Amino acid sequence: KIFKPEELRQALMPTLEALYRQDPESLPFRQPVDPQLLGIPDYFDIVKSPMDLSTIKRKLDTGQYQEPWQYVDDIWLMFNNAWLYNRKTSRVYKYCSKLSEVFEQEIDPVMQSL
Ligand SMILES: [Cl-]
């Protein structure tokens, strides 16, 4: 179906809030990564399409997702970036896995309703 932007926003936003409210796990994902500041110059060599919670929120607010799967894809892109760039024993890697689990429980019922 064609999705009215506000209908989408209303359905998806709670799932994004749930991730944002995961403390401390969501902390590393609330703002775009800044390799200059963080002193990790090689970040963009590894991560070709940066994504994060704030960017996803902005796209959601500005009606830039026409369909639910698009939002899901951005969520997974964010996760995959973190798993890719961070060692599997790192804090960020584990935070990422936790967010992944929270998302799964959140998104399933929502997708059905859409
Ligand atoms: Cl949107």
Author numbering: 1047 to 1070, 1071A, 1072 to 1160
In the authors' words:
Bromodomains (BRDs) are protein interaction modules that specifically recognize ε-N-lysine acetylation motifs, a key event in the reading process of epigenetic marks. Despite large sequence variations, all BRD modules share a conserved fold that comprises a left-handed bundle of four α helices (αZ, αA, αB, αC), linked by loop regions of variable length (ZA and BC loops), which line the Kac binding site and determine binding specificity. The four helices form a deep cavity that is extended by the two loop regions (ZA and BC loops), creating a largely hydrophobic Kac binding pocket.
Also, WDR9(2) and EP300 exclusively interacted with the triply modified H3 pT3K4acK9ac peptide.
